[PDB]
Amino acid sequence: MRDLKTYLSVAPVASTLWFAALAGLLIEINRFFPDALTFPFF
Amino acid sequence: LNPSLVISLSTGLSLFLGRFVFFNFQRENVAKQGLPEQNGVTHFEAGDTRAKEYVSLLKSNDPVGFNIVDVLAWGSIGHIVAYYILATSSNGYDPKF
Amino acid sequence: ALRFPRFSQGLAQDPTTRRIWFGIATAHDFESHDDITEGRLYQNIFASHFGQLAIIFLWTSGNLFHVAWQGNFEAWVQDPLHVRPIAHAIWDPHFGQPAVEAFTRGGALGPVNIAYSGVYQWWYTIGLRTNEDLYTGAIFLLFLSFISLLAGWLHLQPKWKPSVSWFKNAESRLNHHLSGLFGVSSLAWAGHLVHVAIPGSRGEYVRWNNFLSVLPHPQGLGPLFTGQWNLYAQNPDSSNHLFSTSQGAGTAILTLLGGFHPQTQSLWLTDMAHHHLAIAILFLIGGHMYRTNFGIGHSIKYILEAHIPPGGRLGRGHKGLYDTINNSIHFQLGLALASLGVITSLVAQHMYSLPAYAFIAQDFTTQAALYTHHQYIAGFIMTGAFAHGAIFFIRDYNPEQNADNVLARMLEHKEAIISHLSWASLFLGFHTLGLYVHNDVMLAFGTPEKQILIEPIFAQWIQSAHGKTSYGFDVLLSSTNSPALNAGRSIWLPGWLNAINENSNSLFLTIGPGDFLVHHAIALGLHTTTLILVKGALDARGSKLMPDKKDFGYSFPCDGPGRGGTCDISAWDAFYLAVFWMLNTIGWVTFYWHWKHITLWQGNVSQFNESSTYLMGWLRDYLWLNSSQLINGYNPFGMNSLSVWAWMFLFGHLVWATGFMFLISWRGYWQELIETLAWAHERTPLANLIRWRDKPVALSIVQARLVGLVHFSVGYIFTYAAFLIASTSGKFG
Amino acid sequence: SHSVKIYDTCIGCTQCVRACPTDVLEMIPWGGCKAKQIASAPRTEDCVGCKRCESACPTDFLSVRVYLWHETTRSMGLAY
Amino acid sequence: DWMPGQPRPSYLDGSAPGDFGFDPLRLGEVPENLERFKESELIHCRWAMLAVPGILVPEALGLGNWVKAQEWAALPGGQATYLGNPVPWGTLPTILVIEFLSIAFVEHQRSMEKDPEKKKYPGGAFDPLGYSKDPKKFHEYKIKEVKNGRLALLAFVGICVQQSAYPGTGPLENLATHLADPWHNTIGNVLIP
Amino acid sequence: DIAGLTPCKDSKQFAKREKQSIKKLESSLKLYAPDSAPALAINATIEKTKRRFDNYGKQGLLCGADGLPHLIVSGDQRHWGEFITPGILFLYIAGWIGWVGRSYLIAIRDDKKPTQKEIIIDVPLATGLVFRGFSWPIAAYRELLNGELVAKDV
Amino acid sequence: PPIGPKRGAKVKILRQESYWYKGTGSVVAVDQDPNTRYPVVVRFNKVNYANVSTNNYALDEVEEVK
Ligand code: CLA
Ligand code: CLA
Ligand code: CLA
Ligand code: CLA
Ligand SMILES: CC1=C(/C=C/C(C)=C/C=C/C(C)=C/C=C/C=C(C)/C=C/C=C(C)/C=C/C2=C(C)CCCC2(C)C)C(C)(C)CCC1
Ligand code: SF4
Ligand code: SF4
Ligand code: SF4
Ligand SMILES: [Ca+2]
């Protein structure tokens, strides 16, 4: 548990989880505001 | 317009300037800059026989030291600007405001 | 001595084949020869310069003689646009009958080569008309090269050899080279253009036997001395003028028009005469700067030492630079190579946009060949400039004599320079590649409008400032009440604005987003090549991985496998690595130029404008598309005149590929293979009766890197030249 | 013949001597350190230029340096 | 002090005529540059103090502005005009070269001195009235001089940038259009168009 | 207009591209059941394509001779949405990332085994540190003014 | 009277052929012996390229820093 928490924070696993979260975020963002070549709000 | 008028006048003015106005300045600058040197010696003192200053023709009888090569330089300047004046005075060019 | 090579005792005692190899590859490194002094070094350099001059003159006269003998000149001057120029005849006993019939072009009586050097247009522009002219020229050049050899010999005995003191006289040499080598030469060329070429472009045939009988101007030399110089421009050639005929010709010898000749699409001859005259005047006046035996002028050393900024941001300024430049031959060579390379690529950029020779703008593949040739040469020269900078820093740099001047302060903050060069190249690479890949994906998914096209608005604005009127910016020279446009409106602006706003030439081609992307590829190439070279130069004297590199020389294998491994740690290895990037960047440059022009020459510029923004466009619409005739040079159904290129094209692919061997496989492998080969030879009957005299060894480490680089670059040059000449020559447009 | 030099930063560890394939180096008395020993190179005519000795030097920078030089058949390690 | 509450540069104590401790770029850090700087500042100030009356008073009279008054030369048959009279030696080249060698002679004569205080304050033939008799009335005259001169430099740079803002207009014309409607004819419309 | 380009909404090649694009998808919809899963998916992307073209038209993009929306980066205020405001957003996000990383590196530099906290992230410390990136611009400005952003001594 | 910096000090390196040149290290021991040309022994927090973290130096090569 403590050691599982440690292993889940080793560099490869920390980075894969981080990048999976980032990928999910970007994917959803472009799923809501697709085909965006500019910033049209202000 | 009269080319010879202008050439003689301009080179005479340049020579007057060189002998009576900028002489001392040019002399002190040529003194403080000195002879070119390689490795601390002048070019003649390093073994170059051809790089010896021509002390015979450089000495002159002018009260201040005006000699052949400086009349050459000043007069050539006078001629250059005289011909510039002639050429541009009859090129017929005109800009516009 | 007692063996080849004699300039080296350490190599002469080498019992292996290495002695031969290295014996050849260090022949001109005079500073590393046995019993070398400074006098020997300088005198050998002088003599070999004379030898190189002899080689150059022999080469150009070989060109002239062959064009005169087996050429096409007299027929070509009659109709420059509808006949192909011949370089020389072909005699190849390996040729077949259909090859003989296929190569007989240009109206010749046998197989010939078609010239793409552009010597026909050059010689036609300057005045040569008949074969007798070319024969006299070739004979004169043979004479000149013989005299060059005679001088090279004469200045090698005692009795005539100069002292090192003479070679280091910088002020007088600069005086002469500026005023005499550049000034009087340019003045004489203006004289030839005024006396021979300008009349030759109006019908008259001025030659040696009559040039004292012909006035170049109706009022010869009166205007010059009376001051009324304008009389030498009072009647230019009318704009409906056939080149070597008097139909529509004038009498002006000097002028400033700026446009092109309407028929030939090249610069006016009188404009070039005036240009050479003007720059001759400038060089002559500027060559009286430095002090010599006459007690006036400048002392370069004093000017250098006087340029030190108070506030000490530059340390000691340039104090001590005269002596480190005058005593270092590698510093001088690096400066010469740098300036020469920059002006070489300047030549390349100016010769395609402002052509000087008649009917060369309409010979497209001559244009392409000239551009690519000069750009590759400029790239090699730049790499050499940096290599000799590094060699200087190792061999001729003296730290204590250069205490705190600009050179030492360059050396002492090398980390900042290298890190920032690396940042710039990382930024450019990341973003240029990223934009290209984004576009490629956008077009793979079938959505053209989802691309990230950036308009090169700064270059378009500059083009507008020169007078182009296709982007509607209305700046200088494309304004209407500007001082710039009004001030030259009567001298050269008419012709200039007429030529720039014409869109059938190459003077300031229209640019779009593809031009933006490829220019940033160019910028990345330049920055990365300079990163490699500058890192090699500033790290030549030692780094943290090897602090004592300077006493190992310029080129060495490595520093063993210790401390993590030190493969390719020399500065020679940095040069070796930078040549790859030089080749790559010049490749990008020449690809860009060739594709833009090959689409402009077909009136299909939209093809480039649209397919240049993604790399599949470059692959398919440029490489795969323009390569059909070339690879069809010969096929199972016969061959045509392109076969020689189709062959060379594959040749360059082979060479390139074998260059990979020497670059990937390393020495140990080959050495052990060679040793078992030696066993095999010594152990076999009827052949152990024959014995080698040098023990066979695998190539050295540095030698192998050199051989692989040579193979790589030769293959590169050959395959690209084949493709370029075959793809432009096939369409001839 | 390659040229091997020993510099006075030598701590006389002798790891390099125990590393060389051709018995070029040696240990000799000295007084400049706590081992009273320093490395000598009396037989550099047998040095192959392998530079194992440099990878065994624990000093910084190295105290044993091999400068490759003119090649012999001994230097090139050729058995034919 | 040029800015109350700001420490002074060490090399600028306050004895020199006109020293108010202004040197944000620290250009006068090295004393032998500061000497030349004092000299050049005085020369500039004197030129501009002479120039600004010459820019203003002819336009105050019925003549063209300072830039209109120097544009006949841009036309081939250029002929000057002083007070409404065509000067005889009025063409461009005569004017140009007489001005050239006149100024060159006098300027060389000026920099052929190595006092270096008479370099800025030569006096003698240039002090007919002899206002340099009292060494402290002299000092406050020095202060008044460099003060008025800095003001005149300011006024001149203002004149020329106003000219670049309203091309073909004179400074008094600008004063006139400002007085015509002060609340609407100001720098505002040239800062925010 | 700028660089000779024309407003895509009024361009003809931009429209022609839109109609051509929309045309091919419609063909893919055919030869299947009118209300099938694949047909429904093709319809969805057709509407998506129409929305993208109308969105491009609405945002006032510049179209060349090929009808492709070119991007102006010179600084013209009619076009900041194309490069400059996205650029400011990027610089903000990248400064966030870099500042958080630098903050973390500085915080863990004081242990005996600092490499241990680099191959194995201290996630509690990292989560304490991540949100300082929000104010990273002010913090970095005041660190530069303080003189503590750049290491002296090097 | 001992020689060189005291034990445990913080000294800056001045030998430019050293990996830690212009860096800092902690003194471990300076032999009081004469006859030794490099008495100071310095330990660093970073290995060099040879994976070594201690080195001997002469008294002039080290310079006690703050
Ligand atoms: C197509 C081949 C290729 C490519 C892409 C590169 C690319 C690069 N070279 Mg290189 N080079 C090459 C061939 C190549 N080289 C060859 C044949 C030689 C001769 C041996 C050299 C010799 C050479 C030298 C000597 C140097 C470089 C340098 C560089 C870098 C320059 C900086 C830059 O442009 O930013 C980046 C450009 C890129 C193209 C990187 C794009 C890759 C992206 C980031 C992939 C993104 C990953 C993505 C998320 C998915 C990953 C997949 C997953 C499995 C992980 C760059 C990464 C210089 C350098 O180091 O710069 C400081 C350097 O000094 N090169
Ligand atoms: C005015 C130009 C110039 C001059 C005078 C020199 C002069 C010199 N160079 Mg240098 N150099 C130059 C330009 C020049 N270089 C350029 C442009 C480059 C970039 C390519 C270099 C890169 C360079 C390097 C990397 C080195 C030198 C070195 C040297 C020194 C010894 C050269 C030597 O003798 O090796 C012997 C000559 C050869 C080995 C040439 C034979 C092999 C060539 C390269 C192959 C030719 C290609 C092939 C035959 C043609 C294709 C075959 C066919 C199918 C068409 C010498 C003083 C060397 C040196 O010692 O530094 C001090 C050194 O290492 N140069
Ligand atoms: C007026 C006197 C004079 C003249 C004419 C020369 C002339 C020359 N000297 Mg010399 N020299 C002189 C005085 C003079 N020197 C003195 C007083 C000294 C004592 C200090 C020396 C010491 C000296 C040394 C040590 C050396 C020379 C060398 C040379 C040769 C230079 C190499 C070369 O030919 O490249 C040609 C250069 C040009 C043609 C001009 C440059 C053109 C530029 C680069 C570009 C042109 C662009 C244009 C478009 C070209 C058209 C192309 C198209 C036609 C195809 C050259 C012929 C070198 C040599 O001897 O080589 C054998 C050399 O080693 N000189
Ligand atoms: C296209 C590039 C290329 C070429 C031509 C070769 C060629 C060769 N490789 Mg190599 N290799 C390459 C790439 C290449 N390699 C690369 C990139 C690598 C890195 C992985 C390697 C790694 C490698 C290894 C590890 C080995 C080889 C070996 C060999 C040799 C195999 C024996 C043989 O085939 O005899 C015949 C020669 C040929 C087929 C070459 C073509 C012969 C031409 C067509 C004949 C023309 C003759 C002509 C008339 C000459 C006269 C011209 C005159 C003007 C002088 C051979 C010469 C092996 C070897 O050494 O063999 C014992 C070996 O072990 N290669
Ligand atoms: C390594 C080394 C070296 C080498 C180096 C090099 C190689 C360098 C270079 C460099 C380069 C290669 C450079 C270049 C340059 C250029 C420039 C810098 C430019 C320019 C210009 C300008 C400024 C312009 C202007 C103009 C005009 C005039 C008109 C029109 C407009 C314009 C703007 C265009 C040496 C030996 C020395 C030393 C040692 C180290
Ligand atoms: S170049 Fe060869 S010998 Fe040198 S370190 Fe690399 S692998 Fe070892
Ligand atoms: S190079 Fe090799 S053989 Fe020579 S001393 Fe070093 S380890 Fe021994
Ligand atoms: S390994 Fe280095 S320090 Fe140790 S004995 Fe050998 S040469 Fe001396
Ligand atoms: Ca054009």
Q: Quick check: D9 and G58 in contact, CB under 8 A?
A: no
Alpha carbons C598 and C592: distance in angstroms, whole number: 10
Chains B vs G: touching, with 3+ CB pairs under 8 Å? no
Name the β-bridge partners of D9.
Answer: none
Structural domain for C386, as ranges: 1-733
Task: Nearest by CB to C675, from D54, D69, D80: name it.
Answer: D80
| Residues of chain B with C-beta less than 8 angstroms from the C-beta of C296 | 30, 69-70, 73
Q: Do the chains contact at C455 and F72, CB–CB below 8 Å? A: yes
Q: Which position has the token pair 């182009």? A: C468
| Residue of C342, C391, C535, C539 to mutate, ligand 5, most atoms within 8 A of C-beta | C342
Buried-exposed string C617-626: b where 16+ CB fall within 10 A, e elsewhere = bbeebbeeeb
Structural domain for G37, as ranges: 1-66
Count up the domains in chain A and report the number: 1
Task: Decide if domain E31-191 falls under CATH 1.10.3460.10.
Answer: yes
Q: Which position has the token pair 């003028």? A: C241
The protein residue with its alpha carbon nearest to ligand 2, atom 57, reads C29
Structural domain for A24, as ranges: 1-42
Pairing mode, strands G54-57 and G24-30: unpaired
Instruction: Detail the DSSP E strand segments found in chain F.
Output: 6-7, 62-63, 69-70
Alpha carbons E184 and C97: distance in angstroms, whole number: 93
Distance C427 CA to ligand 1 centre (A): 12
Q: Quick check: C70 and C88 in contact, CB under 8 A?
A: yes
The DSSP annotation for E7-67 comes to PPPTT--S-STT-----TT-TT-SHHHHHHHHHHHHHHHHHHHHHHHHHHHHHHTTS--TT
Alpha carbons C534 and C334: distance in angstroms, whole number: 13
Residue F29: which residues within 8 A CB-CB, separation 6 or more?
A: F39, F42, F43, F46
Task: Nearest by CB to F65, from C448, C473, C606: name it.
Answer: C606
Nearest to E31 by CA among E2, E54, E11: E11
Q: Which atom of ligand 3 is nearest to the CA of C151?
A: 62
Peptide bond into D61 cis (omega under 30): yes
Cβ count within 10 A of residue C452: 19
Element (H, E) at G41: strand G40-43
Q: Do the chains contact at E76 and B94, CB–CB below 8 Å? A: yes
Cα C607 to chain centroid, rounded: 30
Experimentally determined by: cryo-EM
Q: Is D33 annotated as a binding residue?
A: no
| Two structure tokens written together for F59 | 């945002």
Residue G57: which residues within 8 A CB-CB, separation 6 or more?
A: G13, G15, G18, G38, G40, G41, G42
Sorted by where each begins, the domain ranges of chain F are: 1-154
Nearest residue on chain D to C556, alpha-carbon basis: D68
The 3-state DSSP class for residue B42 equals: strand
| Residue of D4, D5, D9, D10 to mutate, ligand 8, most atoms within 8 A of C-beta | D10
Q: Is C450 on the interface with A (CB under 8 A)?
A: yes
Element (H, E) at C297: none
Q: Quick check: C342 and C381 in contact, CB under 8 A?
A: no
Q: Is C562 on the interface with G (CB under 8 A)?
A: yes
C317: alpha, beta or left, given left = phi > 0 and alpha = psi -120 to 50? left
Q: Chains C, G: CB contacts under 8 A, how many? A: 14
Q: Is C643 exposed, middle or buried (0-12, 13-18, 19+ CB in 10 A)?
A: buried
- How many angstroms separate the CA of residue A17 from the nearest CA in chain F? 13
Q: Is C455 on the interface with A (CB under 8 A)?
A: no
| Residues of chain F with C-beta less than 8 angstroms from the C-beta of C471 | 2-4
Count up the domains in chain C and report the number: 1
Distance D13 CA to ligand 8 centre (A): 5
CATH number of the structural domain spanning residue A9: 1.20.5.510
Q: Do the chains contact at D55 and C562, CB–CB below 8 Å? A: yes
Nearest to C193 by CA among C116, C276, C304: C276
- Angle between helix axes C364-395 and C572-600 (nearest 10 degrees) is 160
| Two structure tokens written together for B77 | 């300047």
Chains B vs A: touching, with 3+ CB pairs under 8 Å? no
Alpha carbons B67 and C434: distance in angstroms, whole number: 71
Write down which chains contact chain G via at least 3 CB pairs under 8 A. Answer: C, D
- CA distances to C519, C610, C670 from C511, rounded to whole Å, are 11, 12, 52
Residue B33: which residues within 8 A CB-CB, separation 6 or more?
A: C291, C298, C299, C302, C303
Q: Do the chains contact at A39 and F61, CB–CB below 8 Å? A: no
Q: Quick check: C391 and C146 in contact, CB under 8 A?
A: no
Distance C716 CA to ligand 5 centre (A): 28
Element (H, E) at C657: helix C643-664
Task: Nearest by CB to C227, from B50, B83, B96: name it.
Answer: B83
- How many angstroms separate the CA of residue A21 from the nearest CA in chain C? 22
C563, C566, C567: best to mutate for the G interface, most G CBs within 10 A: C563
Residue C202: which residues within 8 A CB-CB, separation 6 or more?
A: C237, C244, C245, C246, C249
Q: Do the chains contact at A35 and F52, CB–CB below 8 Å? A: yes
Q: Which atom of ligand 8 is nearest to the CA of D15?
A: 1
Q: Is C564 exposed, middle or buried (0-12, 13-18, 19+ CB in 10 A)?
A: exposed
Query: Which runs of consecutive H residues, i.e. helices, occur in C5-130?
Result: 9-12, 18-25, 38-69, 73-76, 97-103, 119-126
Ligand nearest to the CA of D74: 7
Task: Nearest by CB to A9, from F55, F86, F121: name it.
Answer: F121
Q: Which position has the token pair 């022609």? A: F16
- How many angstroms separate the CA of residue G36 from the nearest CA in chain D? 5
Count of positions (residues) in chain A? 42
| Two structure tokens written together for C404 | 């705190």
Name the β-bridge partners of F7.
Answer: F62
Cα C180 to chain centroid, rounded: 25
Q: Quick check: C694 and C16 in contact, CB under 8 A?
A: yes
| Residues of chain C with C-beta less than 8 angstroms from the C-beta of A37 | 450, 452
Q: Do the chains contact at C294 and B69, CB–CB below 8 Å? A: yes
| Residues of chain E with C-beta less than 8 angstroms from the C-beta of B97 | 71, 74-75
Residue C355: which residues within 8 A CB-CB, separation 6 or more?
A: C260, C265, C266, C267, C361, C367
What letter represents residue C721's amino acid? Answer: A
Residue E187: which residues within 8 A CB-CB, separation 6 or more?
A: none
Cα C11 to chain centroid, rounded: 35
Q: Which atom of ligand 4 is nearest to the CA of C665?
A: 19
Count up the domains in chain B and report the number: 1
- How many angstroms separate the CA of residue G14 from the nearest CA in chain D? 13
Sorted by where each begins, the domain ranges of chain E are: 31-191
Nearest to A11 by CA among F115, F98, F131: F115
Q: Which position has the token pair 């240029």? A: C432
Phi, psi of C724 (to 5 degrees): -65, -50
Q: Quick check: C618 and C710 in contact, CB under 8 A?
A: no
The DSSP annotation for D17-64 comes to TTT-TT---EEEE-SSSSSSEEEE-TTGGG--S--HHHHH--SSS-SE
Q: Do the chains contact at G55 and D34, CB–CB below 8 Å? A: no
DSSP state of F134: G
The 3-state DSSP class for residue F102 equals: helix
Q: Give Rg (Cα) of chain C.
A: 29
Phi, psi of B72 (to 5 degrees): -60, -50
Provide the Cα torsion C554, C560, C561, C562; round to 10°: -100
Ligand nearest to the CA of C389: 5
- CA distances to C9, C488, C699, C707 from C694, rounded to whole Å, are 16, 73, 13, 20
Q: Quick check: B60 and E34 in contact, CB under 8 A?
A: no
Largest Cα–Cα distance of chain F, in whole Å?
Answer: 75
Name the β-bridge partners of D3.
Answer: D67
Q: Give Rg (Cα) of chain D.
A: 13
Q: Quick check: F3 and C460 in contact, CB under 8 A?
A: yes
Count up the domains in chain G and report the number: 1
Cβ count within 10 A of residue C257: 23
Task: Nearest by CB to C326, from B38, B50, B53: name it.
Answer: B38
| Residues of chain C with C-beta less than 8 angstroms from the C-beta of A35 | 447, 450
Distance C287 CA to ligand 2 centre (A): 32
Nearest to B37 by CA among D5, C327, C388: C327
Alpha carbons C29 and C572: distance in angstroms, whole number: 14
Alpha carbons F120 and A14: distance in angstroms, whole number: 9
Q: Do the chains contact at G37 and D32, CB–CB below 8 Å? A: yes
Instruction: Detail the DSSP E strand segments found in C545-590.
Output: none
Q: Give Rg (Cα) of chain A.
A: 16
Q: What share of chain G is helix, strand, coil (3-state, %, to 5)?
A: 0, 35, 65
Alpha carbons C271 and C255: distance in angstroms, whole number: 6
Q: Which atom of ligand 6 is nearest to the CA of C701?
A: 1
Q: Do the chains contact at F71 and C453, CB–CB below 8 Å? A: yes
Alpha carbons E112 and E101: distance in angstroms, whole number: 16
Nearest residue on chain C to G19, alpha-carbon basis: C544
| Residues of chain G with C-beta less than 8 angstroms from the C-beta of D8 | 37
Alpha carbons C585 and C503: distance in angstroms, whole number: 28
B:17-46 residues touching chain C, CB 8 A cutoff? 30, 32-39, 43, 46
- How many angstroms separate the CA of residue E123 from the nearest CA in chain B? 22
* Resolution value (Å, 1 decimal): 2.7
Nearest to F135 by CA among F76, F106, F92: F92
- CA distances to A14, F56, F57 from F51, rounded to whole Å, are 39, 9, 10
- How many angstroms separate the CA of residue C256 from the nearest CA in chain B? 12
Name the β-bridge partners of D67.
Answer: D3
Ligand nearest to the CA of C662: 4
Alpha carbons E120 and E117: distance in angstroms, whole number: 6
F51: alpha, beta or left, given left = phi > 0 and alpha = psi -120 to 50? alpha
Q: Chains C, E: CB contacts under 8 A, how many? A: 4
